[PDB]
């Protein structure tokens, strides 16, 4: 079975028994990545005397919005020696050399079957390599990246404060903000967390797939372009139906030239400055699609959408969705 030959009317089904991974493999993961995060957190890098003073789950580990097919697991890193994002970003290399170093004499890493170390390319660069879990002894890829610590502790979902942001905007993606990348999409109704899964499934499967050398967007951009459809379509109902849903991102996808979202959950327009850069973003080139966590990003920028909206226009051609009366399933108003 698969998603294009899945009706509409059993979408709900699909995703809990073919997207789903099983709990208890979900477990046997993070029990390995659990070692990497405490090596971290508790190693003392001789560089001065570097530490990790926080480490996060990023991504579909840190989200969840993990798939049966998901084998990677990512990770930022908290530098104790980065003091400004112009740090970071001098030393971003210097650092993860520092921890691939230190992680080949680590006996609990080593223990856990460490192979593979290498640092990839990843815009920003990667510290990439794969631990064996400890029960099945499987293996699975993680990625640290480094990041200056911009922002002190808070509840998940609080605003920053301008200063943050004046400063990134002074300074001239950015791992310092990645809690609340996270954050964005992590707290949300499990209907909406299905609804992302499926739309990453059909992108990675039906797009990435086909076209795996193309300058395609990341997977965050979908996930906020998900998140809008479903809060301006929805008015953020923890009840939708998910085949509506479905169709409503691929008609978006369709119409990625005329695309404009922003969000000011982390930001407002009330620093003079903040408002300056957001208005400046908001007249460029579409798609826009500004990062919540970073008002200095178009996640959109630069990439292929034209190749996902082909595969957006076959897609709506498929089984997901008609109903069973052959009917194209109708999308949400905005």
Known sequence: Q??????????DSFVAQWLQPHREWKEEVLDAVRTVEEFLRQEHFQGQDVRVLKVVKVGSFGNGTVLRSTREVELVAFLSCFHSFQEAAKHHKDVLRLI???????????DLGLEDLRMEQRVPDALVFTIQTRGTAEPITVTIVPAYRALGPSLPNSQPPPEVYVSLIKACFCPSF?????NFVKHRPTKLKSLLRLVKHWYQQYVKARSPRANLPPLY????????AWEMGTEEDENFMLDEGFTTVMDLLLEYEVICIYWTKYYTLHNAI???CV????????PIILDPADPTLNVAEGYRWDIVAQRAS??????????????PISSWNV
Do not use: F, G, V
């Not at 698969?2 to 979408?11: D, K, N, V």
């Not at 951009?221 to 809008?228: F, G, P, Q, S």
């Open 2 to 11: 698969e998603l294009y030959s899945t009706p509409a009317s059993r979408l």
């Open 100 to 110: 691939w170093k230190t992680m080949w004499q680590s006996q609990d890493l080593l």
């Open 178 to 182: 990645s809690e609340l990348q996270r």
């Open 221 to 228: 951009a979908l996930e906020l372009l998900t998140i809008y």
């Open 274 to 276: 903040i408002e300056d």
């Open 279 to 286: 208005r400046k973003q908001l007249k460029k080139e579409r």
């Open 314 to 327: 076959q897609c709506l051609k498929q089984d997901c969705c008609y109903d069973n009366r052959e009917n």
